Amino acid sequence: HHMSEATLLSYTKKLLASPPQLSSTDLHDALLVILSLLQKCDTNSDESLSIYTKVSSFLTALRVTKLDHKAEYIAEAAKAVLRHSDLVDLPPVILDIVGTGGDGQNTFNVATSAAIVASGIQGLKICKHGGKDLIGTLGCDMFKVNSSTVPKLWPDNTFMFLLAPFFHHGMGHVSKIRKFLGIPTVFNVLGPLLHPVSHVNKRILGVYSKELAPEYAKAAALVYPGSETFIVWGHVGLDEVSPIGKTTVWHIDPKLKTFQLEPSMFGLEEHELSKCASYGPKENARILKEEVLSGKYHLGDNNPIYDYILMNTAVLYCLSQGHQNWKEGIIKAEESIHSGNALRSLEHFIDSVSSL
């Protein structure tokens, strides 16, 4: 039996060596062992204490060596977790927007909001992956969107949402030990790299750390070799295009290119993070539906959430078209809202899911 505490311990001892002897493929194998062992831990037995002790030890040693912030290790970790996932089988620019989280900022769900707005723009198709429940609260049974139903939804939907917990069963096995650990681990950066639809060909991936971002760009290129990718880090410490101060962008186009964004480049005022707060999924959904997708606010209203969504939508648009015309992105975003195209795109998805 290779999938044992003994095997995991041999991987941890490699991390304790000077210098460490754990390869990127060793981390892949270690994570398969960890996902096998954690499935046996259904009680607070002494066997569970022993397994949690060894899994804690391995993930903490990885973090201290910082190998879990190296592109090749991140890619191998994503690959291991995906062995426990449902993958979508499918027979045009298709985009995702998602962040790592871990910035501790409590900001509005701009990822799902901007994904919906971008999906109203002619020639854009959005397959947004993420979540822990914004769309969930708009009378949509998100459990119905799964490996068997995505192919059926695909052809007639400009917008789709895939709820990560329904695909990534491996991420479910580590949920309790991650909470107990209280420290970041390799698991904190895997979410964006686990998209179960291979047809996505461009994405924005937010990251919590300036230090992590360039290795994360390289990881994204390894996990998503087809994809043109923006990695984004807000200088205030934000896994998003920030509504306040500057954002750095690392650009992968299949060279690591870099540029910088600030709200003035979009013709927007700055808004403190306090003004772009999250209210949790139910109220975030209501704001999005009743204040934003309804057309109640416009460019020039200086409404913080509306502006935050418009800006991130503009970046998605410019990414989709291969240019940096940020103000044209704002125009297309504003049009998607005020034409009714954004709302009709979301309603088509919600209807399509209800019909299943």
Added chain:
Amino acid sequence: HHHMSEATLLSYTKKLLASPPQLSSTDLHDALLVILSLLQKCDTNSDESLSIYTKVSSFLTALRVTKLDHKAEYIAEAAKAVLRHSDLVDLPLVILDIVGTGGDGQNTFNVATSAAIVASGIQGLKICKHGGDLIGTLGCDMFKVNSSTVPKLWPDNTFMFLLAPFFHHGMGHVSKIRKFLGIPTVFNVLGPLLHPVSHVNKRILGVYSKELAPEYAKAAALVYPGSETFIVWGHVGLDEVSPIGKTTVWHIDPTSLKTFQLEPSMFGLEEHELSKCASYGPKENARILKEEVLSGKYHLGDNNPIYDYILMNTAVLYCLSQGHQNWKEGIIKAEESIHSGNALRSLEHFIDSVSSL
């Protein structure tokens, strides 16, 4: 909210994740007090118990990877935190110990306990050996030797053995998670620093590595400020004075960092491979020590490997005790302790004292 909490322990782990780590030696002391409180209060099969083991594992593993737990001030603060959960011996106002850290991966004969017994038969020496099973198997219950009974045994014993688990309740609390971890942690180097009798004057402290030795010398001076101390490392990779090749000694002389080299030829002994000085198990080791050594069956010049191994380590204890490096005189004194019957008598007197408890 409370200081003794998972939240406090997590704050210390996060300090170890910083570049460079921000955990001070006094932080490690406090972290160990937290760990020992969390583990003492553990509710069996609770969700809290599983979270606690997760956070304690995390902290001790992060510490080991940073290697802060092998710096003198950290080792000493860690020993001092553990001792806050120990029973120290209170006695009324030359006494030696001999012990190794272990972790040399060498399953060699228990020369520390053996040499402690032979040295105890030398007139003018008193041995208070602390550690640990060999002494268990000789017909005295070591569980009877505790902080309350050492004062009773003290006055009329030339030899005592103190079994660490009956003093160090804090070491007891981490025993299970140490087994589950399966990796070395700070705990693996604390044993020699936890002697509960402050009256010990001098000691040999073996260490498993050359790298640890100089930091361990500084830690031992902090933990045992009164004590003249030999830190010893056998070049073959041994926390003992090696019966093959050279041993380095780091000499803590608080009257006066001096280091010197030992080899068996300096004692008038042939070298013996570690394979001829193996541990045959605690029952069988007790029989060898009692029937081959303390009986006087073997002599100096017979080149019996385990006998010579014991005789050399005894001679180092003796020279340490007297403030000289006349290693061959230490051998003469060790030889006489055996062949007079003094060594055996010292042992049997301690066994009889413990039995009477």
